[PDB]
Amino acid sequence: KHDYTNPPWNAKVPVQRAMQWMPISQKAGAAWGVDPQLITAIIAIESGGNPNAVSKSNAIGLMQLKASTSGRDVYRRMGWSGEPTTSELKNPERNISMGAAYLNILETGPLAGIEDPKVLQYALVVSYANGAGALLRTFSSDRKKAISKINDLDADEFLEHVARNHPAPQAPRYIYKLEQALDAMLEHHH
Numbered sequence: 151k152h153d154y155t156n157p158p159w160n161a162k163v164p165v166q167r168a169m170q171w172m173p174i175s176q177k178a179g180a181a182w183g184v185d186p187q188l189i190t191a192i193i194a195i196e197s198g199g200n201p202n203a204v205s206k207s208n209a210i211g212l213m214q215l216k217a218s219t220s221g222r223d224v225y226r227r228m229g230w231s232g233e234p235t236t237s238e239l240k241n242p243e244r245n246i247s248m249g250a251a252y253l254n255i256l257e258t259g260p261l262a263g264i265e266d267p268k269v270l271q272y273a274l275v276v277s278y279a280n281g282a283g284a285l286l287r288t289f290s291s292d293r294k295k296a297i298s299k300i301n302d303l304d305a306d307e308f309l310e311h312v313a314r315n316h317p318a319p320q321a322p323r324y325i326y327k328l329e330q331a332l333d334a335m336l337e338h339h340h
Contacts, residue, residue, distance in 0.1 A: 151314040154322035161327070165190065165334035167199025171212060172340060174243050178250035184257075188271060189213075189250055191331035192278060195324065201242045210239035213249030224251045256282055263297040268305040272312075275328050280318040288315050 168190045175193070179186035196214040197203040209216045215224075215234075222233040228251070238244050256274055260282035264270045276285050288311070289296035303311060313322040 152316075152319045152322050154313055154319070154326050159327050159330050161194060161330040161334035164194035164198040165331055165338070168193035168197075168212075169335075169338050169340075170199060171242055171246060172338075174246045175250075178246045181247070182250040182254040184250045184253045185271070187332065187335055188253065188274065189246065190335065191328050192249060192253075192275070193246070194331050194334075195275075195327045201240060201245070208236070210236060211245035212242055213245055213252075215239055215245060215248050215252065220252050221248065223255060224248045227251060227255055253278065260286065260293070261297075263301070265301050266305065269300065269303065269308050272305055272308050272325050272328075273300065275324045276312060276316070276321050279324040280316070280321045284317065285312075285321070288312070288317075 171193060172186065172190060175186040175189040178184070179189055193199060193212045197212045199212070201212050203212070203214065204210055205214060207216065215221050217233045217235065217239060221239065225231070225233055234244070234248065239248075253274060256277050257270065261270065261273050261277060264273055273282075273285065286293055286296040289299040300308070309322060309325050312325065316322060
């Protein structure tokens with residue numbers, strides 16, 4: 151299985167920088183029914199709080215949204231045509247709003263039916279990172295039985311399952327990082 155804890159990841163500075171955006175994250179989380187600390191952790195992991203981050207593949211901004219994929223998914227959810235521009239994705243308020251929208255899409259879409267909010271949290275970071283489809287297929291080729299299998303595990307067993315069974319090494323590591331980010335956030339009484 152993936153040695154996902156290696157190397158240790160110090161969340162202090164990445165969470166401190168993501169916390170700068172918390173007032174936006176609070177409002178975005180409220181609008182979309184999404185946990186602002188989950189938003190904050192994702193910013194910390196994805197961009198380390200850097201609103202100008204651009205990946206090899208042109209994922210953009212605080213929550214690393216890609217116009218042609220997640221960006222477009224959000225626009226389709228809102229009933230809008232087309233997709234956002236690079237410039238728009240760079241704007242921190244728009245970026246975080248779309249990241250929150252995307253987390254809601256995952257929750258209400260492919261991940262609908264997961265009972266344990268902690269398991270759901272882990273299922274969200276894994277899907278955001280490496281795709282809800284690939285996570286589900288890790289359990290069963292049909293969605294229905296995959297969710298049923300997910301429902302039989304507690305949060306620790308879910309991590310374990312991902313560590314042993316997910317093709318992408320980064321998947322279980324995203325859960326490790328998330329917990330490191332949650333630990334760091336304990337020191338921010340927001």
